[PDB]
Write a protein that binds this ligand. Structure first.
Ligand SMILES: *[C@@H]1O[C@H](CO)[C@@H](O[C@@H]2O[C@H](CO)[C@@H](O)[C@H](O)[C@H]2NC(C)=O)[C@H](O)[C@H]1NC(C)=O
Ligand SMILES: *[C@@H]1O[C@H](CO)[C@@H](O)[C@H](O)[C@H]1NC(C)=O
Ligand SMILES: *[C@@H]1O[C@H](CO)[C@@H](O)[C@H](O)[C@H]1NC(C)=O
Ligand SMILES: [Mn+2]
Length: 568
């Protein structure tokens, strides 16, 4: 199969007949996991979904067996240590364990530095960077009030001064206030307030408000009863839920619907669709299995989290009108819109690890996609504009497929197609793995500070509550169940099978079906991603014990370790 644009194909009546058959058999079926994007239906849509699920099953079985072996080992070791009767006992949950299912190990520094405020705040700029926003001096009010004396001891200034200087930031999970909780499961609905401290030039936590029950406000000065430490725990619990259900819409639902629109309008012979098919490897396995293995009643999610299934579906439906917007989710557009990059109303964040690694990856991807588009369309914008199948795709996405905020048609320049395909590659090869893939087990779901559920009521009092936080955290057993669940979202075999971001474009069918310019661009991409992978693998702590300004080694965007596709 040598790929052809429609005008290059002398076999074109049969080509178009094939596309009309796809259009009769590959339909827009109901959205899965809530009110997001359509899912493939009809006989062909069912067969595509089934094909993907069937391929996915093999690595899922192998990996689950690995995770259960590792789990039995770790549980033996927690038994020899006499259980989990302290916070610092939780290290036994990870020490020398999970070598089979999580061979990259837990992110260094997570367990060792788990009380660090700077770690807690910098996680909002790394492990889940999709909630934080800067507070505009005049267009945003303060999310809540904080004791003036407390603020001044903490900051040597005031909230009005920091707010006016554009140095305040907020991560707001208060939408969880009135969620249903499962019996004997609890959670708050925290709003966390952060600031960029002019003294240390560090992005630091300032206050956490639960927004539930007694609706109390916490601060690093609340050292009594381990209150502040617990508040962070509560926030992380909310935040983990956010990051995992956020990623249902972004990347999964968006990529799925954009690609479904392409499958209905472009030939299998089309170079662009073949590229997209590579990026979307196994993608349509995720939401069906989510319905029946993960989010079912009930159900591994329900067995480890604090909310029932209909709250997951509620969150998806509530967030998709925003998080499903295609152009709004381009890397730069999103971080600028939230005021974290190029903000005119506040100082630049000194360290933003997600944006640093992410923007570099986007540039490497874009160099490849620019060469791909140039070779395919012979350096001609008119050839893009005259590609009837490409234009059919864009109109299908903007119309019957219901893609939100897609690129408006017609799409008449190479540059715009480059933006679209670069963003697809970003979604399947990078963003997915910032939020999901190995990120939870290695960082954002690391116990004790990131439990998937709480096990005692959120305190109604600062003074009259227990100083022992073990009642809220999962037990010795439920910790092993949590780490097992999150370990089953890792896929180590992408490394030995070269199914990683580094080899995203090195597909045999793409190398054979495109010309020599394709191969040369692939070679450049593979080399660049290999160098970035070498750098990420080599990250170490500096003299102050800080990697990328953080008390932990963040390797979630190592191109040599993460899939090129939406693997789980
Ligand atoms: C976070 O925990 C890590 C453990 O990996 C600490 O790492 C050490 O950091 C010092 C510098 O402070 C280095 O000289 C050591 O070589 C590091 N050890 C290892 C095994 O990497 C790190 O200091 C901690 N960071 C903070 C801020 O507490
Ligand atoms: C024309 O396209 C159809 C559909 O793929 C195929 O069966 C036929 O062999 C093609 N003809 C040539 C000469 O490639
Ligand atoms: C993986 O890719 C490298 C090229 O960088 C190659 O040397 C190796 O043989 C490949 N392994 C497999 C299984 O594809
Ligand atoms: Mn996923």
């Amino acid at each position: 199969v040598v790929y052809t644009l429609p005008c290059e194909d002398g076999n074109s009546t049969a080509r178009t007949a094939e596309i009309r058959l796809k259009q009769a058999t590959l339909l827009y079926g109901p959205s899965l996991l809530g009110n997001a994007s359509y899912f493939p239906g009809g006989p062909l849509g069912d067969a595509i979904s089934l094909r993907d699920q069937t391929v996915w099953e093999g690595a899922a079985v192998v990996q689950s067996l690995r995770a259960f072996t590792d789990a039995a080992k770790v549980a033996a070791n927690i038994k020899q240590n006499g259980g989990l009767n302290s916070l610092d006992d939780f290290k036994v949950l990870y020490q020398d364990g999970w070598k089979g299912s999580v061979p990259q190990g837990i992110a260094r520094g997570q367990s060792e530095n788990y009380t660090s405020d700077l770690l807690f705040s910098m996680e909002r700029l790394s492990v889940n960077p999709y909630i934080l926003k800067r507070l505009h001096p005049t267009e945003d009010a303060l999310p809540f009030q904080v004791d003036r004396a407390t603020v001044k001891q903490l900051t040597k200034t005031s909230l009005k001064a920091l707010h006016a200087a554009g140095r305040l930031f907020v991560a707001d999970h208060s939408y969880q206030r009135n969620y249903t909780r499962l019996a004997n499961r609890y959670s708050a609905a925290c709003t966390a307030l952060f600031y960029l401290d002019p003294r240390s030039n560090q992005f630091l936590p300032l206050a956490i408000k639960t927004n539930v029950g007694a609706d109390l406000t916490y601060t690093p000065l609340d050292t009594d009863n381990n209150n502040w430490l617990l508040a962070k725990i509560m926030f992380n619990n909310n935040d983990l839920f956010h990051g995992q259900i956020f990623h249902v819409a972004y990347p999964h639902a968006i990529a799925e619907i954009v690609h479904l629109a392409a499958l209905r309008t472009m030939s299998a012979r089309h170079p662009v669709l073949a590229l997209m098919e590579r990026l979307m490897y196994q993608a349509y396995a995720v939401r069906p299995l989510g319905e029946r293995v993960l989010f079912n009643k009930g159900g591994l999610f329900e067995q480890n989290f604090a909310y029932p299934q209909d709250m997951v579906y509620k969150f998806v439906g509530d967030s998709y009108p925003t998080t499903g917007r295609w152009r709004a989710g381009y890397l730069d557009t999103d971080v600028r819109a939230r005021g974290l990059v190029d903000a005119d109303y506040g100082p630049e964040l000194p360290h933003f690890p997600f944006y640093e690694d992410g923007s570099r990856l986007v540039e490497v991807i874009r160099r490849f996609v620019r060469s791909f588009v140039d070779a395919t369309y012979h350096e001609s914008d008119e050839m893009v504009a005259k590609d009837a199948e490409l234009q059919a795709w864009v109109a299908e996405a903007n119309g019957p497929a219901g893609v939100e905020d897609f690129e408006p048609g017609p799409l008449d320049t190479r540059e715009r197609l480059v933006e679209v395909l670069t963003h697809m590659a970003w979604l399947t090869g990078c963003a997915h793995h910032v939020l999901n893939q190995g990120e939870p087990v290695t960082a954002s779901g690391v116990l004790p500070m990131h439990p998937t559920a709480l096990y005692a009521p959120v305190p109604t009092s600062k003074a009259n509550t227990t100083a022992d936080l073990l009642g809220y955290l999962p037990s010795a057993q439920k910790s092993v169940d949590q780490v097992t669940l999150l370990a089953r979202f890792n896929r180590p075999d992408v490394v030995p099978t070269n199914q990683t971001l580094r080899y995203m474009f090195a597909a045999p069918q793409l190398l054979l079906g495109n010309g020599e310019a394709y191969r040369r661009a692939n070679q450049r991409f593979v080399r660049a991603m290999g160098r970035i992978s070498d750098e990420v693998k080599a990250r170490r702590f500096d003299d102050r014990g800080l990697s990328q300004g953080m008390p932990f080694i963040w390797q979630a965007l190592d191109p040599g370790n993460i899939p090129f596709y939406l693997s789980v």
